[PDB]
């Protein structure tokens with residue numbers, strides 16, 4: 245059960261945008277949310293940015309937590325991985341950028357036994373989780389520490405060697421002013437003609453509506469109780485980031501999932517090389 249729709253035309257698109265917003269968001273509760281979510285202090289916002297890696301690492305050090313997520317994958321990403329593969333067992337090279345404990349990595353590794361995955365995260369405890377997974381295998385997976393906003397992926401990944409990059413619930417954790425750095429870093433490992441598969445929180449997702457006072461860092465940008473952060477993307481903001489860093493939009497769609505979750509799921513192409 246799914247229904248996919250594309251609205252074209254200035255008037256048609258705007259009318260639908262506002263209709264869907266009003267069906268999730270009470271239109272007067274919009275003003276209420278903006279007044280109630282008062283802004284975190286500059287001092288604390290600086291600390292949260294400086295401690296981005298530390299707060300994720302502390303999250304992964306928790307006990308009493310099932311970090312693993314069944315059904316976290318999607319049919320859409322699996323189909324994208326079957327595209328342009330002549331043989332089911334053909335070698336395919338991927339990067340799972342911001343891999344966490346591997347909830348996207350390991351399901352993808354069971355798709356094609358000659359998938360080779362680079363995988364990186366800035367949390368050392370996440371990387372240890374990856375390396376201790378039952379499915380971990382150095383002939384299938386090269387995992388390494390990398391802060392995507394400032395460590396060059398080329399230190400570990402040969403240039404233009406990757407057939408697909410996954411960027412799944414990662415970019416929303418990055419400061420909006422630094423998101424472009426992440427995509428520029430990724431650009432250099434991706435083969436011309438190949439894509440980033442993106443999925444992340446979207447505007448007016450349930451989580452955004454639940455955040456309270458002194459959780460708001462900025463428009464669409466919140467800190468969670470564990471100090472990690474979530475930005476809630478609009479389609480246009482996300483497309484502009486990718487266009488500004490050299491990609492072409494293929495797919496860029498809101499996903500409504502029923503509790504009304506709002507995600508953005510997208511596919512952005514690195515252009516074929518020219519003359």
Ligand SMILES: Nc1ncnc2c1ncn2[C@@H]1O[C@H](CSCC[C@H](N)C(=O)O)[C@@H](O)[C@H]1O
Pocket residue numbers: 296300301316341342343344345346347348364365366367370390391392393411412413414417418
């Ligand atoms: N600047 C950065 N560089 C590298 N990893 C980052 C990062 N900012 C956030 N992360 C990582 O992004 C992850 C988000 S959780 C999503 C993990 C995985 N892609 C999945 O789909 O399950 C966390 O593991 C966090 O440590």
